[PDB]
Amino acid sequence: RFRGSNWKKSRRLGISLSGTGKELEKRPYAPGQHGPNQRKKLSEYGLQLREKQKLRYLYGMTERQFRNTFDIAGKKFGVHGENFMILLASRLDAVVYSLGLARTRRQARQLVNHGHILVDGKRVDIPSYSVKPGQTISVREKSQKLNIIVESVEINNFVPEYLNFDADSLTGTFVRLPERSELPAEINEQLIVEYYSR
């Protein structure tokens, strides 16, 4: 949806969490123009905007397309501060990042056709799938065994919580309740819980 390089997400933002090594062959200093100079200090509203831009490259849906995402991480009752990390893992990228189909989120959004999609009935080729207690995000009859669906079947052993994945199946249908602290913590919570409100 960004149609650009996916290597500037760990340079303009301060929370990428998409790859292990990225500053090994790059230059982990400051920005681009003044990359050989010193760094700065994120502003009050800037830190909440930097995280939004940091999640802008991470989340497939950008400004206006992620309406539900922001709407579910604000008005929704519960821990408003940690509502951006709780009610935001209901996408189709989580299933691919828990079964072993795509290591990135952008590739996980395009893995809703090449990889497992048939979630025990009606499927969805969007970046977010309605996986609830009863949906088994699996593959189709003709696309039972794919190349991107059965790529890292043995390379990705450790799986995440509230997710299921096996050999020649990769059907997620475990717990429906997820963790609100089972995600990277680099951005502020109350800051985004107030700024968004406005």
Partner RNA sequence: CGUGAGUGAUGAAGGUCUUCGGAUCGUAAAACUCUGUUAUUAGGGAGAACAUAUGUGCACAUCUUGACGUACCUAAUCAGAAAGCCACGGCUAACUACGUGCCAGCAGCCGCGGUAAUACGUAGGUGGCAAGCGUUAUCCGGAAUUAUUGGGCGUAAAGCGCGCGUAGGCGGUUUUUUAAGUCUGAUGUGAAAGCCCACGGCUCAACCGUGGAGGGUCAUUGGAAACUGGA
**Interface residue list for RNA (CB under 7 A):** 1-4, 8, 12, 31-34, 53, 56, 62-65, 75, 110, 112-118, 122-127, 139-140, 142-143, 146-149, 151
Q: Which stretch binds another protein (CB under 8 A): 34-42, 90-98, 121-129, 131-139?
A: 34-42
Q: Which stretch binds another protein (CB under 8 A): 120-128, 131-139, 158-166, 187-195?
A: 187-195
Torsions phi, psi for 119 (to 5 deg): -85, 70
- State the binding partner of 197 from another protein, RNA, none, CB within 5 to 8 A by kind: none
Q: Interaction with another protein in 155-184: which residues (CB under 8 A)?
A: 181
Which residue of 23, 44, 63, 168 would you call a contact of another protein, by CB under 8 A?
44
39 binds another protein (CB under 8 A): yes
- CA dist 139 and 117 (Å) reads 5
Q: Tell me the longest C-alpha to C-alpha distance in the chain.
A: 56
23 binds another protein (CB under 8 A): no
